[PDB]
């Protein structure tokens, strides 16, 4: 709740539609402390990286009102309000959203809207983190380059 | 629905005082107030089209949510916003009048903030428009009513939050 | 196991159905693009060798405590079994992209993985990470942007394949966290 | 000596030294003739004359052109402060001329003449006196403030160039068509009000009565900035009392 | 309290800091070293909050609404001359609910 | 994880670009030595998954009674169980260390931890002895004076950030003494 | 200063190595193209006064704040002061196009430049955003691109002066930043 | 020496004082048993990181209430002030055994701090309770009796000075009682 209330997102999922929220309980953000996944998700606790965050908590909001005994052995997939399509797969009573692993099974909402307790951050597919704030660098000297520039004559091979 | 002097009565009668003669403090301003609060009320009758056209362009029209997608794009959405910026103008000079802003959240508060999140109006756009339109409020009553009227803008802003 | 065509059978099964004519597009579609599922799982088993060692490797650059002493792919019979288990799962997972449903994926790979690495000791955090980087290739070979490795397909579509084998490894990912 | 040689452009020219090959070429004008070599180094110079010439007292210069940046920066840690004087001071300038240690930006404003109008004007004299550990809490909180106020105001900006680029179809689609208005260009057409404009409508600036979504998000970004402005003078002010907060420890 | 007169402004100066550099002389230093700080104290000396602002919002009275009947939370003077009390008690309420006294 | 800084918004229709009233005071001055902290929380993350092995079976070798039978882990159940309670100090160490705060430290793990493993018949003062392990251990690397791994990093001191997370490890050692 | 040529001995210096065949071939190329060079800062030089105006007043067109009451642009002693600065800047990047190396341009006018204009209460947003305006015009000036005014010229290509000019803008605003 | 040492210790201000070769042996010549003396100090400011770190902790680990909330070792800015607090005794024993004397380490150190810590409210048993932890430590080293390390020293006998860094431990917790 407080990431959505700092990123923005929260103005979406407050809305009436029938959405199908997949919040974390705050071990799976206790458990982002993995030597694999704090690699794609460390850079957003930058001040300016709200961008992918939104982007990132997006891909836990479905359209629509998926309780779990609506998935009896169904595997159904759906994009989120992110933009990119995750599958959501209920079998042998072990209800999967992307990498989730549901927990709690759902909670009852305002405006027929469901929340499931997940045990992990579901990432999107294709995303990519963002690179670390870096050096603007400049070529030291500009005949270094013109050097590094194959010239017509060497094109052909008629120089080495 | 209470004004300064029905509060004060309304305080006072529940304990059935009569009215404890500080009770009067404010009940003896605000008739010193009096004087400021109907031309402060007088103006923004005459300019509120202007008002609110000085508002949307200072704040909000410079931003998306005016562009396709943002929150304000087709014309029947548009219109709802002036429509809808006009009670907060307006409703505030009736808080600004009966120096009491017991109204506001009688008739303008109490389901608002719950109804904006149904249709997913932006909040955080709303009050900016809302303070700007305190600021150019603050522009024609002058100084000592732009803070008078400028106490139930954020009023609205704070509850509405 | 169950596959795409006896999935629809065991759901009109419980509701004492006949497999009528709104249910046959949904597998008329499926065998309108046999062509593609086809062209799409033979991408992954030409690179299943290569792959498997980009994953594996890519799992201890990013966390090099698996190769320390006292570790989880330090000796050489740690090491093989973490190449094994890379192409098992993959093999599992190009079967389970080949029939058309995750069954397979959820009676035989995942028939209590997670209580195997628990009691194996094996970190599940890397597990994750040798997983999905299997998915991220097979996005990329499914769709034929691999960086380095480009094969001859006739001119199409495959975002539904490559969005299907994503929830395949995902699947996987849920059931060992 | 260190020292000595620092003060002579300060004293006698009225700068900085401009860079390490000046202030090196001066230890050679010592090391071949020694101290009044050396003093008359700086009185007979074509730089001495063109400026003060005969008759001036030499003074502190703030020209405006500065040929190195960083010898405006140093001339300022040099003579900052009306009250101050060079009694007992330590050595400041070889780090900054070879880019060791940067001058801190409060000891610029200890240097430079005091202006009457700021936009942010100085809380030096009202900054409470508190701790050393409540000084340090209280500039990391502000710094932490503008690190925020710097990246919402380049989401600002990124909304000027995605107003502009909503717009640029029509904004040079219509810069070719012919538009002729009805009066206010040539004066044998009346125009009533609009000779010029009538009558206070000109506004605080000129850039408020212009309309238009680019307009719009330009004074978001100048309220934006304003906050940005003011929180980045106050990490000016609590840092300057942190050196005196150590310089007199 | 600052008794600290005898710790004076050279307080945490810590001039034992000694580095041999090998075999040779023992070259002590006088470097402050200070903590993993953070000097935790509320309401700093300047504003840092620049516009972005509109959160106050009045105290919850109940069920009826913020602020309407403050008539309980309320305020004094006579109560009359032939007022004359009361049997019962059903002891004090929160303020009749919705109505104010003008209702 | 996501908590332990403050992520600006700048969009419009978000809440909290206008009306939210306040950047975090406290947070957004912790950016302030940021860059120095999110190198020494990579320093441990990086080498979890290695440090948790090292220091139970450090608290093996230096007490042999715990692997013997009827000690308490000897059973597989029990061997898993004492590997996941020091991967999960040592993640809600590295909250603290990140956050700049042992609130979170106290709330999560440390809360009625003395009073779970004396019900449970787990040795407290064997259990303090593989925490401060991973004291010399996390100490080790974030002043990069680790034997057989170093790490390539900016020029500089990280002095009073291992200090701060002796302070921790401590915190928890005399919590579930 | 260094020019060029003064670079490219100061990297054989580095190694005591003599300026030999194999990296005259690249010198010989950029004395050929030397005429076009000359042709580039011609087309920036002539425009130069116009190039302050367009920029200066163009920055005020997206910051009404600086030509309010205590405002940066406000007064008129200000206004002089900004368009004096505005052409320092485009006259040491025509030094360093001229030059054909940036370093009259990294320690005469950029380095310091930023705590200089701390100090005095320059905002240095408005700079980049300045700076990013003469940057455009020059790029349109160099490939003869310019709506308003055409220069005459020879035919040919001159799109590798144009990204080298622009490097030199993107250097300023890297250390106002 | 002590003329050079006192000139930046307590004689005045904050400098350093290198000291060289030629001046190194009328300083042994002047300081009794100085070849085992300049060990002795080189055994405790060598380990000055890892003994205060275990004694500020030794005393949470026998008195595990100063981190519970309402202690004096909770809230991070207290909890660094102790051990800041004693890393300052553990110098200041130091340079009371590099000169021989405890005058110094008496009115810069310790004259007034006995009152300092009943105005903040410090539990003054705790403090004796982390410099007997100190008192432990330091004789150990000399000694060359530590437990985990041991250092390479000429052989020779240095119980005479382990008694002399007794003598100035307990004044601080005579002092401070
Ligand atoms: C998204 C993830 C993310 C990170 C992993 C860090 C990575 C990181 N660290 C530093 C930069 C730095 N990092 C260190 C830290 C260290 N150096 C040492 O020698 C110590 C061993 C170690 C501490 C444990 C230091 C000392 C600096 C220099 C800047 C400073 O001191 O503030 C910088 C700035 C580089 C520069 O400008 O020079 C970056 C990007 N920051 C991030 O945003
Ligand atoms: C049904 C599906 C199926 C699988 C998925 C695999 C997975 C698997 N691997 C191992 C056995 C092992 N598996 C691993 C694997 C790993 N450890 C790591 O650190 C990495 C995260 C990961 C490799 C990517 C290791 C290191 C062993 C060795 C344990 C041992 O030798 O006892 C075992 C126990 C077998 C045995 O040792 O007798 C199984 C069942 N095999 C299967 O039959
Ligand atoms: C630090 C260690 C380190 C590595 C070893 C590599 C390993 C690696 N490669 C890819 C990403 C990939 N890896 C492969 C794998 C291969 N390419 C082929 O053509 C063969 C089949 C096979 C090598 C034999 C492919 C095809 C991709 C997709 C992009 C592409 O190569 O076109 C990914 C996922 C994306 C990412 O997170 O970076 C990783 C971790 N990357 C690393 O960061
Ligand atoms: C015995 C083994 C066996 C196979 C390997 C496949 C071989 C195969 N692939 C396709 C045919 C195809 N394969 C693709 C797939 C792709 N094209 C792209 O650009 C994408 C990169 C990729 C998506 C995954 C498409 C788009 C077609 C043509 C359309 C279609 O068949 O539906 C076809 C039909 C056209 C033809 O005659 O070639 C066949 C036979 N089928 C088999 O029976
Ligand atoms: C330049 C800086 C400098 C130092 C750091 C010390 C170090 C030092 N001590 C001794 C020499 C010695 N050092 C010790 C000290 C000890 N031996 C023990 O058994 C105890 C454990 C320990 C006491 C703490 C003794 C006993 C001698 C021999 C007697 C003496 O020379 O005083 C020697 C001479 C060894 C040799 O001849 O090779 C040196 C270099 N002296 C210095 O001049
Ligand atoms: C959020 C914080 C958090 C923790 C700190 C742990 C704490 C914890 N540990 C155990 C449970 C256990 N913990 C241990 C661990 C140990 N016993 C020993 O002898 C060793 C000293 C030590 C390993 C280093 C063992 C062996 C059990 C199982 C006890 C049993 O089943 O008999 C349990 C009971 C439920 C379970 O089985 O997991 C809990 C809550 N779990 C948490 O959720
Ligand atoms: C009898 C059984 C026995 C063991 C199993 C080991 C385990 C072990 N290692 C360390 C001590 C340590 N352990 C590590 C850990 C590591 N070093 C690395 O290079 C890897 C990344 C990582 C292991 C995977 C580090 C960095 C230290 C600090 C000392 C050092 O620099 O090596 C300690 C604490 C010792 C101390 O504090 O003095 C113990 C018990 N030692 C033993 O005596
Ligand atoms: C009213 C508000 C107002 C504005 C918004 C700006 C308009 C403006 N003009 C230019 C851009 C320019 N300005 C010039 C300058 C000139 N053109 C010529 O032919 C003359 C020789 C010379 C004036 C003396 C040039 C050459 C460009 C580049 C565009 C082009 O013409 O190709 C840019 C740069 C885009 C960027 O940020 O990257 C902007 C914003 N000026 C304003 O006044
Ligand atoms: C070597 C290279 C070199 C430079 C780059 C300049 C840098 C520079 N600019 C100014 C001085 C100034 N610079 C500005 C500039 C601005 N305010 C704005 O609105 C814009 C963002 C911006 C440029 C258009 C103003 C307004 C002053 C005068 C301060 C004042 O009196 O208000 C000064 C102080 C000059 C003095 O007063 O003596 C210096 C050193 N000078 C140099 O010698
Ligand atoms: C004293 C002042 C002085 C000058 C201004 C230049 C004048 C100048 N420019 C060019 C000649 C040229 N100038 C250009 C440059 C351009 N043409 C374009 O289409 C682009 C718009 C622009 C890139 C910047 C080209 C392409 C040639 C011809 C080829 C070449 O010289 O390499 C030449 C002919 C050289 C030759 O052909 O051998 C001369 C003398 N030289 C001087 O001595
Ligand atoms: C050069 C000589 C020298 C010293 C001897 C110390 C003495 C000392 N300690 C503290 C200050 C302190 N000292 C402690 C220390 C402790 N409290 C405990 O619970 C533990 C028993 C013990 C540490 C092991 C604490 C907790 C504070 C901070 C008090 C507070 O901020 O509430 C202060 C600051 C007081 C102030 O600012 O007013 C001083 C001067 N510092 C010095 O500079
Ligand atoms: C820099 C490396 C370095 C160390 C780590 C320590 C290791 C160490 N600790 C102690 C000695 C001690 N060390 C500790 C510290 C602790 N004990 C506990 O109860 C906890 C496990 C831990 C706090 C977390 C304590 C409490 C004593 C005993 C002090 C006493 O006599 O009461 C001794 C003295 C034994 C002797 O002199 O013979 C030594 C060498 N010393 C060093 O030079
Ligand atoms: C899809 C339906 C739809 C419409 C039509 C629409 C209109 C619209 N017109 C606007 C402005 C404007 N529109 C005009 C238009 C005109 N001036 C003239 O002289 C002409 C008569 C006329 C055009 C033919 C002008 C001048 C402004 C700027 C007004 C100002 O800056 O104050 C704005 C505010 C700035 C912006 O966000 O673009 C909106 C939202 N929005 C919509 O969603």
Same mark, same amino acid.
């Given at each position: 709740?407080?990431?959505?209330?700092?990123?923005?997102?929260?103005?979406?999922?407050?809305?009436?539609?029938?959405?199908?929220?997949?919040?974390?309980?705050?071990?799976?953000?206790?458990?982002?402390?993995?030597?694999?996944?704090?690699?794609?998700?460390?850079?957003?606790?930058?001040?300016?990286?709200?961008?992918?965050?939104?982007?990132?908590?997006?891909?836990?909001?479905?359209?629509?009102?998926?309780?779990?005994?609506?998935?009896?052995?169904?595997?159904?997939?759906?994009?989120?309000?992110?933009?990119?399509?995750?599958?959501?797969?209920?079998?042998?009573?072990?209800?999967?959203?992307?990498?989730?692993?549901?927990?709690?099974?759902?909670?009852?909402?305002?405006?027929?809207?469901?929340?499931?307790?997940?045990?992990?951050?579901?990432?999107?597919?294709?995303?990519?983190?963002?690179?670390?704030?870096?050096?603007?660098?400049?070529?030291?000297?500009?005949?270094?380059?013109?050097?590094?520039?194959?010239?017509?004559?060497?094109?052909?091979?008629?120089?080495? | 629905?209470?004004?300064?002097?029905?509060?004060?009565?309304?305080?006072?009668?529940?304990?059935?005082?009569?009215?404890?003669?500080?009770?009067?403090?404010?009940?003896?301003?605000?008739?010193?107030?009096?004087?400021?609060?109907?031309?402060?009320?007088?103006?923004?009758?005459?300019?509120?089209?202007?008002?609110?056209?000085?508002?949307?362009?200072?704040?909000?029209?410079?931003?998306?949510?005016?562009?396709?997608?943002?929150? @304000?794009?087709?014309?029947?959405?548009?219109?709802?916003?002036?429509?809808?910026?006009?009670?907060?103008?307006?409703?505030?000079?009736?808080? @600004?009048?009966?120096?009491?802003?017991?109204?506001?959240?009688?008739?303008?508060?109490?389901?608002?903030?719950?109804?904006?999140?149904?249709?997913?109006?932006?909040?955080?756009?709303?009050?900016?428009?809302?303070?700007?339109?305190?600021?150019?409020?603050?522009?024609?009553?002058?100084?000592?009513?732009?803070?008078? @009227?400028?106490?139930?803008?954020?009023?609205?802003?704070?509850?509405?939050? | 196991?169950? &596959?795409?065509?006896?999935?629809?059978?065991?759901?009109?099964? /419980?509701?004492?159905?006949?497999?009528?004519?709104? &249910?046959?597009?949904?597998?008329?579609?499926?065998?309108?693009?046999?062509?593609?599922?086809?062209? $799409?799982?033979?991408?992954?088993?030409?690179? /299943?060798?290569?792959?498997?060692?980009?994953?594996?490797?890519?799992?201890?650059?990013?966390?090099?405590?698996?190769?320390?002493?006292?570790?989880?792919?330090?000796?050489?019979?740690?090491?093989?079994?973490?190449?094994?288990?890379?192409?098992?799962?993959?093999?599992?997972?190009?079967?389970?992209?080949?029939?058309?449903?995750?069954?397979?994926?959820?009676?035989?790979?995942?028939?209590?993985?997670?209580?195997?690495?628990?009691?194996?000791?094996?970190?599940?955090?890397?597990?994750?990470?040798?997983?999905?980087?299997?998915?991220?290739?097979?996005? $990329?070979?499914?769709?034929?942007?691999?960086?380095?490795?480009?094969?001859?397909?006739?001119?199409?579509?495959?975002?539904?394949?490559?969005?299907?084998?994503?929830?395949?490894?995902?699947?996987?990912?849920?059931?060992?966290? | 000596?260190?020292?000595?040689?620092?003060?002579?452009?300060?004293?006698?020219? !009225?700068?900085?030294?401009?860079?390490?090959?000046?202030?090196?070429?001066?230890?050679?004008?010592?090391?071949? !003739? !020694?101290?009044?070599?050396?003093?008359?180094?700086?009185?007979?110079?074509?730089?001495?004359?063109?400026?003060?010439?005969?008759?001036?007292?030499?003074?502190?210069?703030?020209?405006?052109?500065?040929? #190195?940046?960083?010898?405006?920066?140093?001339?300022?840690?040099?003579?900052?402060?009306? *009250?101050?004087?060079?009694?007992?001071?330590?050595?400041?300038?070889?780090?900054?001329?070879?880019?060791?240690?940067?001058?801190?930006?409060?000891?610029?404003?200890?240097?430079?003449?005091?202006?009457?109008?700021?936009?942010?004007?100085?809380?030096?004299?009202?900054?409470?006196?508190?701790?050393?550990?409540?000084?340090?809490?209280?500039?990391?909180? *502000?710094?932490?403030?503008?690190?925020?106020?710097?990246?919402?105001?380049?989401?600002?900006?990124?909304?000027?160039?995605?107003?502009?680029?909503?717009?640029?179809?029509?904004? *040079?689609?219509?810069?070719?068509?012919?538009?002729?208005?009805?009066? !206010?260009?040539? #004066?044998?057409?009346?125009?009533?009000?609009?000779?010029?404009?009538?009558?206070?409508?000109?506004?605080?600036?000129?850039?408020?009565?212009?309309?238009?979504?680019?307009?719009?998000?330009?004074?978001?970004?100048?309220?934006?900035?304003?906050?940005?402005?003011?929180?980045?003078?106050?990490?000016?002010?609590?840092?300057?009392?942190?050196?005196?907060?150590?310089?007199? *420890? | 309290?600052?008794?600290?007169?005898?710790?004076?402004?050279?307080?945490?100066?810590?001039?034992?800091?000694?580095?041999?550099?090998?075999?040779?002389?023992?070259?002590?230093?006088?470097?402050?070293?200070?903590?993993?700080?953070? =000097? =935790?104290?509320?309401?700093?000396?300047?504003?840092?909050?620049?516009?972005?602002?509109?959160?106050?919002?009045?105290?919850?009275?109940?069920?009826?609404?913020?602020?309407?009947?403050?008539?309980?939370?309320?305020?004094?003077?006579?109560?009359?001359?032939?007022?004359?009390? =009361?049997?019962?008690?059903?002891?004090?309420?929160?303020?009749?609910?919705?109505?104010?006294? =003008?209702?």
């Amino acid at each position: 709740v407080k990431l959505l209330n700092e990123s923005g997102v929260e103005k979406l999922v407050e809305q009436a539609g029938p959405y199908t929220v997949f919040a974390p309980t705050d071990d799976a953000f206790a458990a982002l402390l993995e030597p694999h996944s704090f690699n794609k998700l460390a850079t957003l606790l930058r001040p300016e990286n709200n961008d992918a965050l939104r982007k990132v908590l997006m891909h836990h909001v479905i359209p629509g009102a998926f309780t779990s005994a609506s998935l009896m052995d169904r595997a159904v997939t759906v994009k989120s309000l992110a933009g990119e399509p995750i599958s959501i797969m209920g079998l042998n009573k072990l209800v999967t959203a992307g990498t989730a692993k549901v927990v709690r099974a759902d909670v009852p909402c305002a405006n027929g809207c469901i929340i499931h307790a997940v045990s992990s951050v579901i990432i999107p597919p294709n995303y990519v983190p963002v690179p670390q704030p870096t050096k603007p660098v400049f070529p030291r000297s500009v005949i270094a380059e013109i050097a590094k520039l194959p010239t017509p004559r060497q094109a052909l091979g008629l120089d080495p | 629905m209470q004004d300064a002097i029905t509060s004060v009565i309304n305080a006072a009668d529940v304990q059935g005082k009569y009215l404890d003669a500080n009770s009067v403090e404010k009940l003896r301003g605000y008739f010193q107030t009096g004087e400021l609060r109907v031309r402060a009320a007088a103006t923004i009758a005459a300019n509120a089209a202007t008002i609110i056209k000085e508002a949307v362009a200072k704040s909000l029209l410079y931003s998306d949510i005016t562009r396709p997608g943002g929150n @304000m794009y087709t014309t029947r959405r548009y219109a709802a916003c002036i429509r809808d910026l006009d009670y907060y103008l307006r409703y505030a000079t009736y808080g @600004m009048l009966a120096g009491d802003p017991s109204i506001l959240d009688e008739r303008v508060l109490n389901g608002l903030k719950e109804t904006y999140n149904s249709l997913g109006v932006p909040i955080g756009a709303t009050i900016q428009a809302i303070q700007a339109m305190k600021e150019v409020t603050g522009s024609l009553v002058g100084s000592d009513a732009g803070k008078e @009227m400028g106490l139930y803008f954020d009023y609205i802003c704070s509850g509405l939050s | 196991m169950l &596959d795409a065509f006896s999935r629809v059978v065991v759901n009109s099964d /419980a509701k004492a159905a006949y497999v009528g004519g709104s &249910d046959l597009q949904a597998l008329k579609s499926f065998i309108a693009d046999g062509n593609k599922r086809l062209d $799409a799982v033979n991408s992954i088993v030409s690179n /299943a060798s290569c792959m498997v060692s980009d994953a594996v490797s890519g799992m201890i650059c990013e966390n090099p405590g698996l190769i320390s002493p006292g570790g989880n792919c330090y000796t050489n019979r740690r090491m093989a079994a973490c190449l094994r288990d890379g192409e098992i799962i993959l093999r599992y997972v190009s079967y389970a992209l080949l029939a058309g449903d995750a069954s397979v994926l959820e009676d035989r790979c995942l028939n209590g993985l997670k209580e195997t690495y628990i009691a194996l000791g094996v970190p599940t955090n890397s597990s994750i990470r040798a997983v999905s980087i299997m998915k991220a290739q097979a996005v $990329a070979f499914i769709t034929n942007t691999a960086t380095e490795r480009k094969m001859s397909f006739a001119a199409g579509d495959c975002t539904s394949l490559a969005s299907e084998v994503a929830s395949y490894f995902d699947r996987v990912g849920a059931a060992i966290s | 000596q260190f020292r000595f040689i620092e003060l002579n452009f300060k004293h006698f020219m !009225g700068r900085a030294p401009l860079d390490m090959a000046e202030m090196s070429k001066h230890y050679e004008i010592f090391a071949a !003739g !020694g101290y009044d070599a050396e003093v008359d180094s700086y009185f007979d110079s074509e730089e001495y004359l063109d400026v003060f010439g005969l008759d001036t007292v030499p003074y502190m210069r703030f020209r405006g052109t500065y040929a #190195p940046n960083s010898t405006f920066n140093l001339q300022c840690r040099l003579q900052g402060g009306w *009250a101050r004087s060079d009694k007992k001071l330590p050595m400041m300038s070889m780090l900054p001329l070879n880019n060791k240690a940067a001058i801190m930006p409060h000891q610029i404003v200890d240097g430079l003449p005091v202006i009457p109008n700021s936009e942010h004007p100085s809380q030096k004299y009202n900054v409470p006196k508190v701790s050393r550990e409540k000084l340090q809490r209280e500039l990391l909180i *502000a710094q932490g403030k503008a690190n925020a106020l710097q990246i919402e105001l380049d989401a600002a900006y990124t909304s000027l160039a995605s107003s502009r680029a909503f717009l640029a179809p029509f904004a *040079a689609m219509a810069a070719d068509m012919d538009i002729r208005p009805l009066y !206010g260009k040539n #004066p044998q057409v009346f125009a009533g009000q609009f000779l010029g404009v009538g009558a206070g409508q000109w506004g605080k600036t000129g850039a408020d009565t212009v309309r238009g979504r680019s307009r719009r998000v330009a004074a978001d970004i100048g309220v934006k900035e304003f906050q940005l402005e003011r929180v980045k003078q106050l990490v000016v002010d609590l840092q300057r009392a942190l050196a005196l907060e150590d310089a007199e *420890a | 309290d600052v008794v600290n007169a005898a710790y004076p402004k050279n307080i945490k100066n810590k001039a034992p800091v000694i580095s041999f550099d090998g075999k040779k002389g023992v070259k002590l230093e006088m470097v402050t070293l200070q903590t993993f700080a953070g =000097d =935790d104290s509320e309401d700093t000396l300047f504003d840092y909050s620049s516009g972005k602002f509109m959160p106050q919002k009045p105290a919850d009275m109940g069920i009826a609404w913020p602020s309407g009947d403050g008539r309980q939370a309320e305020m004094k003077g006579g109560k009359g001359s032939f007022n004359q009390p =009361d049997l019962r008690k059903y002891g004090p309420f929160p303020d009749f609910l919705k109505r104010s006294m =003008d209702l």
